[PDB]
């Protein structure tokens, strides 16, 4: 149902979806990375501060 | 009242006017009424989520369409601000449906634009779901009230042969506090009224002569009371039946008649009191149902436009108010205008553009 | 998707059905078989021609699966 120009159009469209998906996934990955940053930092520092306080 | 909702690929800015202002090319040569469709700019992820959303929205659309039409019928049954021959619909956004749709706006108050579509859809779905349950329950309770009230009206309906005597019999109609006597009420057809008056005195042994009088009359018979010795009642009612007179199974009872009168007065007042809040409840539910309905259609437009044309999501969506007998011309025009984009992807629903109907 | 065994009975409509599900998001693979093999269901030899689409989206891949199952196409390539 497509001419070569339209096949190319369809492919460009797919590529666009590929790019949009990757862009969204990466943004999600960085946001979660920052949440995990703060969560793990807390876990670790609190855990050892506690150990220190107990020894104190 | 049907409106057409369409969307073009929007490659060029002329599409804003080609769908409205281009008298050379526009609808019925610029004779159909068109207006701008306000759409939020929402986030899309991959194409499969869009596919899911399309399916979900089609299902949500059908659900809400059914709900909003059902509640419209409920109000039609109520007969307040909407009838089947006039006032075909209720106001939406505080304006008439024609006004609402013509100047339709996106309700960002309910569907924040910073959210993903998945969440927007879920939010709408929840709203219309709650509205549906709230009004279904309310309507059922109201219908049950209407039912009981009609049941009481029917109970207190009919002729003296069957009609309740609550509004007929007075204390002064019965011989009360007698050791031997009871007062019975017998219905004698009017044609034999004098025969009853002449005959009742001799229907049974030990009856009180000349005691007969008339409590009520209707178009077929008279209801007369007779005082008689308790033990002759069997002979009285037997022989009365033999002479084609019908005795009612009734004795004076103040408490039952009062209870019936107040229960009817209470149920009628309750009907009025619920009516008051009924119309406000249902009208608000309608308003919101219609707003959500069109919101759903707008989302169906968004999803299909993006799914077919890709991103960026810049499409030219327009509403038409079709003119009588011009459907064919509009379809021919739209086809020639947009057929080159699909040639075969899009009878019953497939057109070379985004297309939905609004059924009003 | 795959260069399978099809008589090109419904491929003219297979493609359109794909366009109907999504706007041709992925190109189809085309092939033609010279002196095609005898189709097992047919029990005789018919020319075979294949035009099958591959999709990256899961909802649509599943949709295509259903179409391929419904349509006269050969699909089970690994």
Swiss-Prot record, chain A:
It is found in: Apical cell membrane; Cytoplasmic vesicle, Secretory vesicle, Synaptic vesicle membrane; Cytoplasmic vesicle, Clathrin-coated vesicle membrane. The modification Phosphotyrosine is found at residue 55. The modification N-acetylalanine is found at residue 1. It comes from the Eukaryota. Expressed in brain (at protein level). V-ATPase is a heteromultimeric enzyme made up of two complexes: the ATP-hydrolytic V1 complex and the proton translocation V0 complex. The V1 complex consists of three catalytic AB heterodimers that form a heterohexamer, three peripheral stalks each consisting of EG heterodimers, one central rotor including subunits D and F, and the regulatory subunits C and H. The proton translocation complex V0 consists of the proton transport subunit a, a ring of proteolipid subunits c9c'', rotary subunit d, subunits e and f, and the accessory subunits ATP6AP1/Ac45 and ATP6AP2/PRR. Belongs to the V-ATPase E subunit family. Subunit of the V1 complex of vacuolar(H+)-ATPase (V-ATPase), a multisubunit enzyme composed of a peripheral complex (V1) that hydrolyzes ATP and a membrane integral complex (V0) that translocates protons. V-ATPase is responsible for acidifying and maintaining the pH of intracellular compartments and in some cell types, is targeted to the plasma membrane, where it is responsible for acidifying the extracellular environment. This is V-type proton ATPase subunit E 1. The gene is Atp6v1e1. The chain holds residues 2 to 57 of 226 of the full protein.
Swiss-Prot record, chain B:
Expressed in brain (at protein level). It is a peripheral membrane protein. It comes from the Eukaryota. GO terms for molecular function: proton-transporting ATPase activity, rotational mechanism. The keyword DNA damage does not apply. This is V-type proton ATPase subunit C 1. The keyword Transport applies. Keywords: Acetylation, Cytoplasmic vesicle, Hydrogen ion transport, Ion transport, Membrane, Synapse, Transport. GO terms for biological process: synaptic vesicle lumen acidification. The modification N-acetylthreonine is found at residue 1. One of its GO terms (cellular component) is clathrin-coated vesicle membrane. Subunit of the V1 complex of vacuolar(H+)-ATPase (V-ATPase), a multisubunit enzyme composed of a peripheral complex (V1) that hydrolyzes ATP and a membrane integral complex (V0) that translocates protons. V-ATPase is responsible for acidifying and maintaining the pH of intracellular compartments and in some cell types, is targeted to the plasma membrane, where it is responsible for acidifying the extracellular environment. Subunit C is necessary for the assembly of the catalytic sector of the enzyme and is likely to have a specific function in its catalytic activity. It comes from Rattus norvegicus (Rat). Pfam families: V-ATPase_C. Belongs to the V-ATPase C subunit family. V-ATPase is a heteromultimeric enzyme made up of two complexes: the ATP-hydrolytic V1 complex and the proton translocation V0 complex. The V1 complex consists of three catalytic AB heterodimers that form a heterohexamer, three peripheral stalks each consisting of EG heterodimers, one central rotor including subunits D and F, and the regulatory subunits C and H. The proton translocation complex V0 consists of the proton transport subunit a, a ring of proteolipid subunits c9c'', rotary subunit d, subunits e and f, and the accessory subunits ATP6AP1/Ac45 and ATP6AP2/PRR. Gene3D superfamilies: 3.30.70.100, subunit c (vma5p) of the yeast v-atpase, domain 2, Vacuolar atp synthase subunit c, domain 1.
Swiss-Prot record, chain C:
It is found in: Cytoplasmic vesicle, Clathrin-coated vesicle membrane; Cytoplasmic vesicle, Secretory vesicle, Synaptic vesicle membrane; Melanosome. It comes from the Eukaryota. Belongs to the V-ATPase 116 kDa subunit family. Subunit of the V0 complex of vacuolar(H+)-ATPase (V-ATPase), a multisubunit enzyme composed of a peripheral complex (V1) that hydrolyzes ATP and a membrane integral complex (V0) that translocates protons. V-ATPase is responsible for the acidification of various organelles, such as lysosomes, endosomes, the trans-Golgi network, and secretory granules, including synaptic vesicles. In certain cell types, can be exported to the plasma membrane, where it is involved in the acidification of the extracellular environment. Required for assembly and activity of the vacuolar ATPase. V-ATPase is a heteromultimeric enzyme made up of two complexes: the ATP-hydrolytic V1 complex and the proton translocation V0 complex. The V1 complex consists of three catalytic AB heterodimers that form a heterohexamer, three peripheral stalks each consisting of EG heterodimers, one central rotor including subunits D and F, and the regulatory subunits C and H. The proton translocation complex V0 consists of the proton transport subunit a, a ring of proteolipid subunits c9c'', rotary subunit d, subunits e and f, and the accessory subunits ATP6AP1/Ac45 and ATP6AP2/PRR. Interacts with SPAAR. This is V-type proton ATPase 116 kDa subunit a 1. The gene is Atp6v0a1. The chain holds residues 170 to 247 of 838 of the full protein.
């Amino acid at each position: 149902a497509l001419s070569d120009a339209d096949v190319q159009k369809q492919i460009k469209h797919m590529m666009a979806f590929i790019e949009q998906e990757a862009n969204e996934k990466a943004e999600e990955i960085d946001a979660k990375a920052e949440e995990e940053f703060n969560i793990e930092k807390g876990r670790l520092v609190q855990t050892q501060r506690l150990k220190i306080m107990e020894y104190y | 009242t049907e409106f057409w909702l369409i969307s073009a690929p929007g490659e060029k800015t002329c599409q804003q006017t080609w769908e409205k202002l281009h008298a050379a090319t526009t609808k019925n040569n610029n004779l159909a009424v068109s207006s701008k469709f306000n759409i939020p700019d929402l986030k899309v992820g991959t194409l499969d989520v869009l596919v899911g959303l399309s399916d979900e929205l089609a299902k949500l659309d059908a659900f809400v369409e059914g709900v909003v039409k059902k509640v419209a019928q409920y109000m039609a049954d109520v007969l307040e601000d909407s009838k089947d021959k006039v006032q075909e619909n209720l106001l939406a956004s505080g304006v008439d449906l024609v006004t609402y749709i013509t100047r339709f706006q996106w309700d960002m108050a309910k569907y924040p634009i910073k959210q993903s579509l998945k969440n927007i859809s879920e939010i709408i779905a929840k709203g219309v779901t709650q509205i549906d349950n709230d009004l279904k329950s309310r309507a059922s309770a109201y219908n049950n009230l209407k039912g009981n009230l009609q049941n009481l009206e029917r109970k207190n309906a009919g002729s003296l042969l069957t009609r309740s005597l609550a509004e007929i019999v007075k204390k002064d109609d019965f011989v009360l506090d007698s050791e031997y006597l009871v007062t019975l009420l017998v219905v004698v057809p009017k044609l034999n009224h004098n025969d009853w008056i002449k005959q009742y005195e001799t229907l049974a042994e030990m009856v009180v002569p000349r005691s007969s009088n008339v409590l009520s009359e209707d178009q077929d018979s008279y209801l007369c009371n007779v005082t008689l010795f308790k033990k002759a009642v069997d002979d009285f009612r037997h022989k009365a039946r033999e002479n084609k007179f019908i005795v009612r199974d009734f004795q004076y009872n103040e408490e039952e008649m009062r209870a019936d009168k107040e229960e009817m007065n209470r149920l009628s007042t309750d009907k009025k009191k619920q009516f008051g809040p009924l119309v406000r409840w249902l009208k608000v539910n309608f308003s919101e149902a219609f707003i959500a309905w069109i919101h759903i259609k707008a989302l169906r437009v968004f999803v299909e436009s993006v799914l077919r044309y890709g991103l960026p999501v810049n499409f030219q969506a327009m509403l038409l108010q079709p003119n009588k007998k011009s459907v064919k011309k509009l379809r021919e025009v739209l086809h020639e205008l947009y057929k080159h984009l699909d040639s075969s992807a899009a009878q019953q629903e497939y057109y070379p553009y985004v297309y939905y109907k609004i059924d009003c | 998707f795959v260069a399978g065994v099809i008589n090109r009975e419904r491929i003219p409509t297979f493609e359109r059905m794909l366009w109907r599900v999504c706007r041709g998001n992925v190109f189809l693979r085309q092939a033609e078989i010279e002196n095609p093999l005898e189709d097992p269901v047919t029990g005789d030899y018919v020319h075979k021609s294949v035009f099958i689409i591959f999709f990256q989206g899961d909802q649509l891949k599943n949709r295509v699966k259903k179409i391929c199952e419904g349509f006269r196409a050969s699909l089970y390539p690994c």
